[PDB]
Amino acid sequence: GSHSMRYFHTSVSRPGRGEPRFITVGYVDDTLFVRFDSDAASPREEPRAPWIEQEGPEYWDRETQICKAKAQTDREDLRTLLRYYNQSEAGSHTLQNMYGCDVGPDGRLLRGYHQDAYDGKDYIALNEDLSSWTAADTAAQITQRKWEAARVAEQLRAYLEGECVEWLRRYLENGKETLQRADPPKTHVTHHPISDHEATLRCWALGFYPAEITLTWQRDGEDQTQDTELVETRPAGDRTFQKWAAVVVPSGEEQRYTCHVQHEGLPKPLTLRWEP
């Protein structure tokens, strides 16, 4: 199918408690493969997937250098943003950045991304054309003017259309055992009486990869979107994901409800019912 590569970065200041903490992680699809934490004993970028371990020492050296450089620029940016927003130096503030690329089945670029947030709010984002910016407020418009004068988008476009895609393709091949394997969900329906007049039906999906999935309850064939309780998809800790969806049904009407599961690992979407 299609695939993605993303690098995530967070810097958090902590006045009176040293310099900002910086954490960055890299993902291919829903698989973590590298990490760097400025508070680690001897901070280096470290592998987190078996298929990246074969990269040589100069790969690791370069990556580590980049991570440390980004940590330093983020420290400078946190000080700048205090000025842009007329903020005190007393508080903790957060800078987040994500960038990366999506490719289709043939490996061609579908689109690239580079976007930032300050204190949890959109700040500036590269537009899909990879040539212009969307700034969220007048503070971000100052960064926009700076990055336009510096021709930042031209450099990012080159990376996103080139290296990003090329290296994603390399990782997909080196990790094809796992990155190109979809694990379908193991599914079942449980039944829990609430009272003499009502019962909970819960539809489970376990052990699936990648994380994208659709679980829906139907009553007499109609989607129960507003009466379905749907938890966030959650990691099992072993590469796979879990999810459930629950409805409250009048006692005796359980057979009018069906749970529908769509996942890229399934050849056909599944229909399940409670089996007493």
Partner: peptide, 10 residues
């Protein structure tokens, strides 16, 4: 493989 500009300060 990560990107690094060859200034990107905000």
């Amino acid at each position: 493989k990560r990107w690094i500009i060859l200034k990107i300060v905000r």
